[PDB]
Structure 1
């Protein structure tokens, strides 16, 4: 394998000519896509990869300076696309990966035919002019709990992030991938995400964006989907689903996979 391919656990599955890239969010890995991948293998070559810092990656590769902003993750994405010789792709970004792909597409819009965002937000912190869902005190509480007992935090946080039954298979899976991260890496990354502010780059986006989220998402109020739709600088469309949870492609695939497939297969009018 190539050096980038190996470092990110890259897989290229399927036999189609066109490319689709599936990019996961915090606390999980490329297995979050397991219910979607089987539906894509004839139409596409499906590119899966893990973000640096996920529990499936080598913690020795986690450069704290490199990843102190989302730009470091966007470089990694562009490096993968370059090594794999992608001409263009549909990019499906979950949670923070929606903004990572957005940043990458501003540097190389030719590589992105469309961006599909799942559970995305350009900013979590409130202020008197913008509702993202969180106050600084909420973050301080979260980070204090993470740092004081990481194992206990994973078990309490997973059911909140996934939503629904606390004993579900999806809660099981997510609690395990959370706890497979090195605690200092997880803490550092979650701080970086929570304090991010991508609002000012949305107007520069030049690739069509499909904005999908659960109607009940603990980290993404529905008004954020409308905010993305308003401020993205080219055509976009919003679909709020009748689901609960931040990883709905994992916890409610019977509802969510058809929605993603629809946005993969149909385009927004120019």
Structure 2
């Protein structure tokens, strides 16, 4: 394996000709895609990778300056796509990875045939002019909790992010990946995500975007999906699903997998 492949736990599965890249969100890893991957093996070559800072990655590679902005993660994605020699791909970014691929696509639009966003937001904090879902006090509270008892925070956060029954399998799975992060990395990364503001780069997007989210998502009001639709600088489409949860591809795969497959297969009218 190449040096980049190894560092990000890169996997390339399936026997298709076209590439599809699945990029996971905060607190989880490439296993979040477990219900989707079996349906792509015949049509594509599926690229899975882990973000630096996930519990599956080496904590000594986490460079706090590099990842102080989402650009740092976008550089990692480009490096992965280069090492693998992708010509073009369909990119599926979950949570923060939606914006990471968006940033990457502005530097290299040739690499991206289409972006599919799941549980995406360009900004979580409110503005007298924009509703992201959170005030600064909400954040201060979250971070005080994380810093004071990470193990306890993971147990209470997991059911909230996942939604539905608090003793479900998906909650256990997310709870476990959450606690596998080094607490100071988890704290730093979630702060970086919650403070971010990508609104101004949306009009520069030149790759069509499919914007998918649960109707009940603790971190993404439904109006943020409309916001991304309005401000993305090219063709885009919204699909709000009748599901609850920030990781719906994991907690409601029976419902969510067909939606993602639909947006992989069909294209938006130019």
Would you say same fold, with TM above 0.5? yes
- CA distance in 2 between counterparts of 1:38 and 1:165 reads 26
Provide the residue aligned with 2:98 in structure 1. Answer: 98
* 1:119 positional shift: 0.3
- CA distance in 2 between counterparts of 1:22 and 1:176 reads 21
- CA distance in 2 between counterparts of 1:40 and 1:84 reads 18
* 1:75 positional shift: 0.1
User: Deviation digits for residues 152-193 of structure 1, max 9, x if unmatched?
Assistant: 000000000000000000000000000000000000000000
* 1:37 positional shift: 0.1
- CA distance in 1 between counterparts of 2:53 and 2:235 reads 33
* 1:233 positional shift: 0.1
- CA distance in 1 between counterparts of 2:221 and 2:145 reads 23
- CA distance in 2 between counterparts of 1:214 and 1:225 reads 10
Corresponding pairs, count: 270
User: Deviation digits for residues 129-150 of structure 1, max 9, x if unmatched?
Assistant: 0000000000000000000000
- CA distance in 1 between counterparts of 2:202 and 2:268 reads 18
- CA distance in 2 between counterparts of 1:117 and 1:100 reads 10
- CA distance in 2 between counterparts of 1:161 and 1:188 reads 18
- CA distance in 2 between counterparts of 1:198 and 1:128 reads 17
- CA distance in 1 between counterparts of 2:98 and 2:138 reads 23
- CA distance in 2 between counterparts of 1:183 and 1:95 reads 20
| Counterpart secondary structure, 1:67 | helix
| Counterpart secondary structure, 1:116 | strand
5+ residue gaps, structure 1: none
- CA distance in 2 between counterparts of 1:235 and 1:222 reads 19
| Counterpart secondary structure, 2:242 | strand
Provide the residue aligned with 1:10 in structure 2. Answer: 10
- CA distance in 1 between counterparts of 2:35 and 2:77 reads 23
- CA distance in 2 between counterparts of 1:141 and 1:156 reads 13
- CA distance in 1 between counterparts of 2:100 and 2:255 reads 26
- CA distance in 2 between counterparts of 1:87 and 1:201 reads 24
| Counterpart secondary structure, 1:237 | strand
- CA distance in 2 between counterparts of 1:126 and 1:179 reads 29
TM-score with structure 2 setting the length: 1.00
- CA distance in 1 between counterparts of 2:61 and 2:127 reads 35
* 1:120 positional shift: 0.1
- CA distance in 1 between counterparts of 2:166 and 2:229 reads 32
* 1:238 positional shift: 0.1
Provide the residue aligned with 1:124 in structure 2. Answer: 124
- CA distance in 2 between counterparts of 1:127 and 1:142 reads 19
User: Deviation digits for residues 99-153 of structure 1, max 9, x if unmatched?
Assistant: 0000000000000000000000000000100000000000000000000000000
User: Deviation digits for residues 68-103 of structure 1, max 9, x if unmatched?
Assistant: 000000000000000000000000000000000000
Large movers: runs of 4+ above 4 Å: none
User: Deviation digits for residues 33-61 of structure 1, max 9, x if unmatched?
Assistant: 00000000000000000000000000000
User: Deviation digits for residues 3-37 of structure 1, max 9, x if unmatched?
Assistant: 00000000000000000000000000000000000
Provide the residue aligned with 1:69 in structure 2. Answer: 69
5+ residue gaps, structure 2: none
